[PDB]
Ligand binder design. Structure first.
Ligand SMILES: [Zn+2]
Length: 48
């Protein structure tokens, strides 16, 4: 549910290892960079 990860920066494609049909909500997210196009967001954490 919910939300996802798609933040203003993140794209939501390429899960944590790009081995998934995207992530749409953090569970994956292969970026991890805090800011931009990554996972910024997630919630809590950013960046990580
Ligand atoms: Zn993401």
């Amino acid at each position: 549910r919910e939300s996802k990860c798609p933040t203003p920066g993140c794209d939501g494609t390429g899960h944590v290892t790009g081995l998934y049909p995207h992530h749409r909500s953090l569970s994956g997210c292969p970026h991890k960079d805090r800011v931009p196009p990554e996972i910024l967001a997630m919630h809590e954490n950013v960046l990580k």
